[PDB]
Amino acid sequence: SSNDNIELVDFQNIMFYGDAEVGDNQQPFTFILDTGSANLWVPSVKCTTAGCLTKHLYDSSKSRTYEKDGTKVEMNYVSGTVSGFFSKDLVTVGNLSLPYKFIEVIDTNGFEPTYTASTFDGILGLGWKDLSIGSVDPIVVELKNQNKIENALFTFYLPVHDKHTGFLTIGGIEERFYEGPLTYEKLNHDLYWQITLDAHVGNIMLEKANCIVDSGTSAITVPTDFLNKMLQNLDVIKVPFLPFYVTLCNNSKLPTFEFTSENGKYTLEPEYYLQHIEDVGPGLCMLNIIGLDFPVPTFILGDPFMRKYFTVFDYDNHSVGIALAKKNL
Ligand SMILES: CCCCCc1ccc(C(=O)N(Cc2ccc(-c3ccc(CC(=O)OC)cc3)cc2)C2CCN(Cc3ncc[nH]3)CC2)cc1
Numbered sequence: 001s002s003n004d005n006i007e008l009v010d011f012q013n014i015m016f017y018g019d020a021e022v023g024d025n026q027q028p029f030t031f032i033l034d035t036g037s038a039n040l041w042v043p044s045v046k047c048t049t050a051g052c053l054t055k056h057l058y059d060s061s062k063s064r065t066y067e068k069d070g071t072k073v074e075m076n077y078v079s080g081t082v083s084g085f086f087s088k089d090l091v092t093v094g095n096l097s098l099p100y101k102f103i104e105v106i107d108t109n110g111f112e113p114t115y116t117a118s119t120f121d122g123i124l125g126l127g128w129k130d131l132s133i134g135s136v137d138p139i140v141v142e143l144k145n146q147n148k149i150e151n152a153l154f155t156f157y158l159p160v161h162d163k164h165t166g167f168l169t170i171g172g173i174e175e176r177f178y179e180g181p182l183t184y185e186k187l188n189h190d191l192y193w194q195i196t197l198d199a200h201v202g203n204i205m206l207e208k209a210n211c212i213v214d215s216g217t218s219a220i221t222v223p224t225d226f227l228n229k230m231l232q233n234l235d236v237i238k239v240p241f242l243p244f245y246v247t248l249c250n251n252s253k254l255p256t257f258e259f260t261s262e263n264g265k266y267t268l269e270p271e272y273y274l275q276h277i278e279d280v281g282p283g284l285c286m287l288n289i290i291g292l293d294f295p296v297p298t299f300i301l302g303d304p305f306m307r308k309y310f311t312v313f314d315y316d317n318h319s320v321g322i323a324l325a326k327k328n329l
Pocket residue numbers: 014015032034036037041042043077082105108111114117118121122123192212214216217218300
């Protein structure tokens with residue numbers, strides 16, 4: 001069915017990764033594929049932090065297609081800095097390749113201990129140009145410009161732990177991934193893949209909420225006050241001194257998220273946002289939900305949402321398409 005298909009590997013129902021190469025010698029890396037960011041971040045052989053010592057590292061000297069840039073990049077994570085500089089080289093994603101401007105990372109310390117604790121080497125952003133450092137056209141946009149695909153879109157069919165594999169597909173929408181109707185939502189900004197949906201959980205509602213479709217976030221995030229209200233009183237317990245909520249897995253009081261527009265209706269039932277934690281208690285689950293406030297009222301529709309719904313990210317039409325993901329592949 002053509003298109004460029006990059007297989008996705010689940011890690012513990014907490015993240016997924018895909019592989020891609022840098023350099024015309026095809027130096028291999030494992031990446032977070034993140035619609036919530038917009039640069040390609042690749043750890044350098046010149047990075048000698050503790051974290052880098054555990055990773056696959058990029059050596060520009062070994063690629064004939066390396067084009068030096070050297071423009072310095074500094075990014076703040078939560079309370080630390082990540083630094084490096086721009087480089088241009090051949091980036092291979094699936095069966096497609098192109099010269100591309102990425103950030104060669106020298107200091108990863110601001111991303112600790114997350115970086116060392118995880119098995120990925122880098123992060124490949126899939127957001128919009130304006131979200132990027134350095135105003136870099138997204139990979140898929142650049143592929144289209146070069147007539148390597150006919151449509152500047154990509155799709156996510158997420159892997160499901162203990163059930164099936166997943167795919168990032170560039171260039172077209174394949175029937176094998178979804179069932180029922182695909183419905184489209186226009187972007188409210190060309191920044192994140194952010195759309196406007198009415199959010200309702202039980203009797204709590206936020207009309208025309210900003211909803212960010214975000215493959216790099218493993219939870220659903222909800223405004224803090226909204227979350228407080230929806231969680232009363234459901235036999236859910238905040239874990240003392242931790243930002244986590246736990247509950248019995250068969251808890252019949254647990255609500256379903258409802259997100260609606262004039263174009264479609266999307267729901268997220270407890271089975272999709274509950275994570276079994278049998279090791280901490282028989283029949284106990286954690287809620288894959290985090291309270292988070294943004295300057296405008298925002299939900300992040302992260303991996304729990306994307307596991308249920310196949311998603312289409314269309315640069316040409318400035319829209320997100322959503323359909324029920326096929327249960328098996
Ligand atoms: C050599 C590699 C250098 C990489 C440098 C770098 C670049 C970008 C970020 C960043 O900030 N991100 C991207 C990000 C994406 C995913 C993760 C991540 C990491 C690990 C795990 C699994 C885990 O639980 O480990 C304990 C799950 C997710 C971490 C960060 C965030 C982008 C914004 N979203 C949240 C968001 N905000 C608005 C919309 N969505 C969260 C991830 C962090 C570091």
